Amino acid sequence: GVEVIIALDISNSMLAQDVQPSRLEKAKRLISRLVDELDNDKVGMIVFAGDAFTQLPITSDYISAKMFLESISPSLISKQGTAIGEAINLATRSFTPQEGVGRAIIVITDGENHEGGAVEAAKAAAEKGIQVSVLGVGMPEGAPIPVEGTNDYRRDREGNVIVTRLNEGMCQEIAKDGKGIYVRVDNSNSAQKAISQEISKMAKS
Amino acid sequence: KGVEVIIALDISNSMLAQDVQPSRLEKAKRLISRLVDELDNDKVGMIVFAGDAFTQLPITSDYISAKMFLESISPSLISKQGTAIGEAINLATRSFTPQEGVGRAIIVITDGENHEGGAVEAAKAAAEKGIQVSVLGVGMPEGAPIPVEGTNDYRRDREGNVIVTRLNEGMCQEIAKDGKGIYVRVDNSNSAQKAISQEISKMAKS
Ligand SMILES: [Cl-]
Ligand SMILES: [Cl-]
Ligand SMILES: [Cl-]
Ligand SMILES: [Cl-]
Ligand SMILES: [Cl-]
Ligand SMILES: [Cl-]
Ligand SMILES: [Cl-]
Ligand SMILES: [Cl-]
Ligand SMILES: [Cl-]
Ligand SMILES: [Mg+2]
Ligand SMILES: [Mg+2]
């Protein structure tokens, strides 16, 4: 039995629709399916934008895990930014006291505009027997972010349309130093299958 | 007291932006349809333009046909891209009846974006022939991306970057001023249509 903590980016950029139906909703589908492949394991979830917080404390209750998953939206966090380092640090503190267990942190993000700290956070996790993997959601080419109520798109401080890009290089550096894997999430089931197989390989270690 | 009205409609790719509902182009068509409903003893013609301009509807009192010619308008009518407002205005001035003593208007409907020059001179030359050139500016000055039909993607430049298109209010205003017509911004209300129909009515009565 292993412990998996998901660190899900819920910043505004995750509402981009360059993966269907959006980055965030694709990420929630993948998590749900990830949970379905778990056996006698425990799963927790952190959400982050400018801050990070524990959305789901580490649990074997998969029915509740899916209900908590389905209620996630960017409105859970008002402060904006991409605080991957804080999320990883929170996750490392969020595992159970048991020794001898395989432990994974799965960061699901577009990796965009992270100031600094994720790489070190991932390094610190790795040296505590935790493997940090990153699932990169979005495309490097860039997409605008639709606004639900209106017919407009998200705008920066100056009032210009925001184009958000997947930053794969950032995602890759985190995963390398966190001793996990990186995979790009696209419309297929490829990312979910790749991370699920990394989980169950860790389980048989 | 009949007048002659020629509409010069921008059908370049930027008119597929959806910052006015349902799009800049489709909003323009709906406005034109209502403009035609307000005509009485009048004639109407239509030109579409992007990189080139052509006559979509020769000047006519047949409003039923005018509306069905409107429906067939889309950007695929012209493949060459650009914003050839001057060419459209110049074509419009050649398209009116020869008859002297008749009020005549050219109504340019566009986001006025990336015009290379000529429009203001063209509008001035129309004005010197007694034709009043008005401009209905569609879109947001603050910019919008251009969705691609059927997909969840957006039009991209050569380098792969999302295109953002803005209404250029300044350019639209210069054209209307020198053309001796009015400038009005098109938004989601019926305000632009009523302003222009008012201008047309005012012309017919003077
Ligand atoms: Cl999936
Ligand atoms: Cl951070
Ligand atoms: Cl970093
Ligand atoms: Cl912009
Ligand atoms: Cl274009
Ligand atoms: Cl209207
Ligand atoms: Cl021109
Ligand atoms: Cl000009
Ligand atoms: Cl861009
Ligand atoms: Mg973001
Ligand atoms: Mg254009």
Say how many Å lie between the CA of residue A125 and the centre of ligand 10.
Answer: 23
- Residues 6 or more apart whose Cβ sits within 8 Å of residue A158: none
Task: Tell me if residue A8 falls in helix, strand or coil.
Answer: strand
Angle, CA B181 vertex, CA B188 and CA B203 arms, to 5°: 100
Measure the CA–CA gap between A160 and B143, rounded to whole angstroms. 7
Furthest CA-CA distance within chain B: 54
- Residues 6 or more apart whose Cβ sits within 8 Å of residue B10: B25, B28, B49, B50, B83, B85, B108, B109, B110, B111, B138
Q: Is there a binding annotation on residue A110? A: yes
Q: What tokens were used for A70?
A: 């389905």
Pairing of strands B4-10, A179-185: unpaired
Measure the CA–CA gap between A46 and A55, rounded to whole angstroms. 5
Number of domains in chain B: 1
- Residues 6 or more apart whose Cβ sits within 8 Å of residue B60: B43, B44, B45, B66
Measure the CA–CA gap between B151 and A153, rounded to whole angstroms. 17
Distance from CA of B18 to the nearest CA of A (A): 7
Say how many Å lie between the CA of residue B162 and the centre of ligand 9.
Answer: 5
Smallest-distance ligand from the CA of A83: 2
Q: What is the CA radius of gyration of chain A?
A: 16
In the Cβ-directed half-sphere of A155, how many Cα atoms lie within 13 Å? Answer: 12
Q: What tokens were used for A8?
A: 């899900």
The answer to whether the Cα torsion of B168, A150, A113, A176 is positive or negative is negative
Smallest-distance ligand from the CA of B171: 8
Q: Find where tokens 């860039």 sit.
A: A142
Say how many Å lie between the CA of residue B113 and the centre of ligand 11.
Answer: 6
Residue pair A48/A86 in contact (Cβ under 8 Å)? The answer is: yes
C-alpha dist (Å) from residue B164 to A153, B19, B146, B169? 11, 11, 7, 16
Measure the CA–CA gap between B130 and B105, rounded to whole angstroms. 9
Q: 3-state SS string over B129-150?
A: CCEEEEEEEECCCCCEECECCC
Closest alpha carbon to B194 in B71, B4, B34: B34
Angle, CA B99 vertex, CA B96 and CA B101 arms, to 5°: 105
Residue pair A57/A44 in contact (Cβ under 8 Å)? The answer is: yes
**Residue A156 CB neighbour total at 10 angstroms:** 9
Q: Resolution, rounded to a tenth of an Å?
A: 2.1
The closest CB to that of A151, out of B21, B152, B162, belongs to B21
State the DSSP code for B153: -
Check B145 against A152: CB less than 8 A apart.
Answer: no
Q: Which helix (H) or strand (E) holds A143?
A: strand A143-144
Measure the CA–CA gap between B48 and B75, rounded to whole angstroms. 9
- Residues 6 or more apart whose Cβ sits within 8 Å of residue A82: A9, A11, A48, A49, A109, A111, A112, A113, A114, A115
Measure the CA–CA gap between B119 and B179, rounded to whole angstroms. 10
Contacts of A163 in chain B (CB under 8 A): 161-162
- Residues 6 or more apart whose Cβ sits within 8 Å of residue B92: B6, B8, B45, B47, B106, B126, B131
Residues spanned by the domain of B4: 1-206
Check A159 against B152: CB less than 8 A apart.
Answer: no
Say how many Å lie between the CA of residue A153 and the centre of ligand 1.
Answer: 26
Q: Is there a binding annotation on residue B111? A: yes
Helices B85-93 and B119-127 meet at what angle, rounded to 10? 20
Residue pair A46/A90 in contact (Cβ under 8 Å)? The answer is: yes
Residue pair B106/B92 in contact (Cβ under 8 Å)? The answer is: yes
Residue pair B125/B93 in contact (Cβ under 8 Å)? The answer is: yes
The answer to whether the Cα torsion of B191, B193, B196, B199 is positive or negative is negative
Angle, CA B35 vertex, CA B86 and CA B20 arms, to 5°: 75
Exposure string (b/e) for A78-88, b if CB count within 10 Å is 16 or more?
A: eeeebbbbbbb
| Residue A2: Cβ-neighbour burial (10 angstroms; 0-12, 13-18, 19+) | buried
Measure the CA–CA gap between B148 and B197, rounded to whole angstroms. 33
Residue pair A148/A103 in contact (Cβ under 8 Å)? The answer is: no
Q: Find where tokens 């958000």 sit.
A: A164
Contacts of A155 in chain B (CB under 8 A): 142
**Residue B5 CA to its chain's centroid (Å):** 12
Q: What tokens were used for A146?
A: 């639709």
- Residues 6 or more apart whose Cβ sits within 8 Å of residue B98: none
Taking the CA atoms of residue B21, residue B22, residue B26 and residue B30 in that order, the dihedral angle to the nearest 10 degrees is: -60
Contacts of A141 in chain B (CB under 8 A): 156, 160-161
Measure the CA–CA gap between A129 and A103, rounded to whole angstroms. 7
φ and ψ at A70, to 5 degrees? -65, -20
Q: What tokens were used for B116?
A: 């290379």
Closest alpha carbon to B126 in B29, B12, B5, B35: B5
Residue pair A177/A193 in contact (Cβ under 8 Å)? The answer is: no
Q: What tokens were used for A56?
A: 């789901």
Residue pair B49/B94 in contact (Cβ under 8 Å)? The answer is: no
SS3 content of chain B, % helix, strand, coil (to 5): 35, 25, 40
Experimental method: X-ray
The identity of residue B154, as a single letter, is Y
Q: The CATH number of the domain where B200 resides is what?
A: 3.40.50.410
Residue pair B43/B5 in contact (Cβ under 8 Å)? The answer is: yes
Distance from CA of A9 to the nearest CA of B (A): 21
